[PDB]
């Protein structure tokens, strides 16, 4: 899944 700081 995407890293914590995605979006």
């Amino acid at each position, epitope marked *: *899944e995407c890293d914590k700081w995605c979006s």
Partner: antibody
Amino acid sequence: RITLKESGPPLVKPTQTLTLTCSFSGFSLSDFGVGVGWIRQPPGKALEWLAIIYSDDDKRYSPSLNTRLTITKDTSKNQVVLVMTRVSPVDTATYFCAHRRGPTTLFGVPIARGPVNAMDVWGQGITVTISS
Amino acid sequence: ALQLTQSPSSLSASVGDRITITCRASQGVTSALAWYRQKPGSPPQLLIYDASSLESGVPSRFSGSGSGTEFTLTISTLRPEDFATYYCQQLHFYPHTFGGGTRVDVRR
């Protein structure tokens, strides 16, 4: 100045449980968005990412080792602990913990996420040998 | 999972050379990529974060560029302390992968 240092047993026997402690200074695991991760390096091999934990307590693990790893933090003692169960010889490696910055804030407002893209300060590493 | 391939795996050079190491990802990682230099017996040291930002206290001969799936680290004027192994690390997707490393040694 941020510094981290790993501690635990240098020798461990197969099937046993390995508990590694990362004690640090210069930051708090209560600071905004900060992370502390663990990376290992078998002798002569490449770095391998293991897990990371953030100050808001989100935890993430390497999918290949997920079932054997537990990472936890003790904010008031400035320590992060990684517990690996059922070790075997292939787990012999030098284990490093490392700091990960949280986003830069301006008057407590997140304005830059570029600084989270790296593990910026590392501990010297602790050598662990798994043999019966 | 996501694959990070470094090239070349090994590279020979001399003091004063310009070298460039490249790292390619199997899926785009935006700019979430870091470069490290690791000298024998020591922990890796952060050189470049967020694909191109120079880490504080790191000498200016180190430079990083690229985004998406292709990144490069170039050391413009190799110094003796640069004979070492370099690694790239992706931080866009979990797990936060490392490349295989590229060893830079004294050419002869």
